[PDB]
Symmetry: C3
Subunit: 297 residues, 3 copies
């Protein structure tokens, strides 16, 4: 007598679904970036609470998502991290190509590079990207060329088909972001929206501004370590300060109802660090996105 | 040289006390509702910090509670959950009957049904009830008729002597409350005060509004899982978002000084989930109620 | 490609440094005050993250601290707590005497007495002190005369060379502070700035007021249990309510740029209670002080 998210998984075939969930159970990217392992367990933890949470008809927000059809495409499987990237990008692109909405649960933030490449191919020369993250993630590769959880947006800014003017680093933190990396983003004409500015404007208002810059066909990329660890402790790099759970929910809801947002990912959920509260927040974030999506034209 | 709550337990006999604490060390109600066991340890954990916290003369709030007399009536003891309910209701009623204030520490939220029945009998046809809770708790019984932590306010709304117009669900959350259960409360003319509305108005202001609806002889029923788990992690169902510890304190203080509030309970404290920070919050909540009570005519 | 705090430890000799870190790895003071042991591990935990955190050039706040030179003078070593106090005071005074800035990481709050005595000797009859703390810490010694983490500011208020008019208890909490101890501070003409007043004014604004009272040569003494345990759980006495991590950062930044602040300590960090999130907050607090210091004339 209380239908929740699980009740929306009514599509017998993937192609019938409005939103397709794809899992990326890898954290080698995190370890390469010197982070704590654990994010490979994120998708499993997310699914666990995906089965339990989120009233489909939300009378507080006045949104009924009963009409949406969700499908779980399972995890990307590969013998190397780099092959996993290839298969993830390919999977995401196919979902985009038929006009469905792919949501990717990680796993390390390195997932965002393949995800971004899927976008750039689905909407040639017309893509926008926002990285919600306390960190810029424009670090160089490892000396042997290897990519990691800290390089995905350097990889995307280096794409010739992508305009940096439409890249926003959202809720980034000056205490954690280097002058060189700030310069790199800004020299690509990308935008830095510091945490303090987000809080001064209000999270939703600032995100609206961000969506104004990202424009059409926006990749909404959410590193959950942008949330204060008081709400979101289960990540490799716990934030002392950052977005609240409510700000996160409110932001995801906006993303959902914003017609230009064409895909979303969520990185850095680490059940080894904390396994109950954090995955629940991650699921509620997706839930708020689903509600917002329910309202879009 | 720093008298605290313990110093107020000066009443040699129960009948001399302004406020009587009653414990309900049961969590079978929680387990029946599919929750995590542990709340049966709540009263013991509460008592542990009851011995240590709360300056009797609070110079920040400018309230001296030195004149109040507290008494600990111990725990309700029974061989079944249902018998415990009977004995709890009977104990609470006797306390109400002689005009003392009963405070019941749980234990699962199922305690609120017997507590409510004590009220309805002490103030026939003139009772008000507010459920501070992220959940509505108007779930049906189990298929075999058994009651649980999720049914107490369905049980009270079904009471013929109780006017639903005077029932408030306070700080409830749309993400956790079903359309059917919202309908049930509203069809009984009960009121839904969503978390977002509480925060928009300010917690104390919204509670004043709530007390205006509940009217005379109000049962102030506080499920501590209405608090964000960042402050209150030690509950069966941890809230991602919700009331802050300060909002909770402020609310309890208001309850205390509000002459129409005739009893209080506090459910869902689960030391198995978290055993130090959460019981301390629970004690400070009671403490703030005691201070407010110290000021009432 | 991302210089952080560690990069500032470029001074080959202690005398070349603008800021000297001194460790006080003792918690016997805490245990005497009936607290939980663990703070003796604070300095080690602080150092661990001192090696990893804090962008030297902060583009969010627009402060480059690249020019500052830090030096780690190691820990004070003694066979008794009282001897450790003597050696700490002596070390701190020498640092003050040559016009450098000593920062002491504890360890129990008893460190603040020797620290205060160093100040009173470096700036005879011209010292100000602010104790950022949920507690007043003006408790009497033990019956055998022994000092503890709860007596340091009674010890300083009893100093004949120190004007109480220039003592501020900042963010103290009425629920934890006794009427007698409030009277003691106020009878010495000291000032009580309750948490509620700090939050009403805004933390930075209230601290500016406090610095106005403390005047010249101010000892900025920060007991990290003044922070809400949601952000700062790793202390002997976890606060249910209190300062946020951001308020703490903002306050430390102000302290840093305030020319009258001549030394700082930080007490009660307890890695045994919580070992990852809390030390990180402690380091970020120091970091924000360092930035502010970078801007001062
Ligand atoms: Mn990232
Ligand atoms: Mn990040
Ligand atoms: Mn409940
Ligand atoms: Mn509840
Ligand atoms: Mn202290
Ligand atoms: Mn303290």
């Amino acid at each position: 007598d209380d239908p929740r998210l699980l009740s929306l998984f009514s599509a017998q075939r993937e192609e019938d679904a409005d939103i397709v969930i794809i899992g990326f159970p890898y954290d080698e990217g995190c370890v390469r970036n010197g982070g704590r392992a654990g994010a490979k367990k994120g998708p499993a933890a997310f699914r666990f609470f995906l089965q339990r949470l989120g009233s489909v008809n939300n009378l507080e927000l006045n949104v009924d998502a009963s009409h949406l059809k969700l499908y779980d495409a399972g995890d990307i499987t590969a013998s190397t991290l780099e092959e996993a990237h290839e298969k993830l990008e390919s999977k995401v692109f196919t979902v985009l190509a038929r006009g469905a909405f792919p949501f990717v649960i990680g796993g390390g933030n390195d997932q965002s590079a393949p995800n971004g490449r899927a976008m750039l191919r689905a909407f040639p020369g017309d893509v926008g990207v926002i990285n919600v993250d306390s960190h810029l993630d424009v670090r160089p590769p490892l000396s042997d060329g290897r990519v990691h959880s800290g390089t995905p947006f350097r990889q995307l800014l280096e794409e010739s088909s992508f305009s940096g003017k439409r890249f926003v680093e959202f809720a980034c933190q000056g205490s954690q972001c280097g002058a060189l990396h700030a310069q790199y983003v800004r020299d690509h004409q990308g935008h830095l929206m510091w945490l303090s500015e987000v809080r001064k404007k209000g999270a939703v208002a600032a995100l609206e501004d961000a969506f104004g810059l990202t424009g059409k066909n926006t990749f909404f990329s959410f590193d959950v370590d942008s949330l204060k660890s008081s709400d979101m402790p289960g990540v490799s790099c716990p934030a002392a300060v950052g977005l609240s759970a409510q700000e996160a929910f409110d932001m995801c809801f906006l993303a959902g109802k914003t017609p230009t947002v064409m895909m979303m990912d969520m990185s850095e959920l680490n059940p080894l660090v904390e396994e109950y509260r954090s995955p629940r927040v991650a699921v509620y974030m997706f839930y708020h996105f689903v509600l917002g999506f329910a309202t879009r034209p």
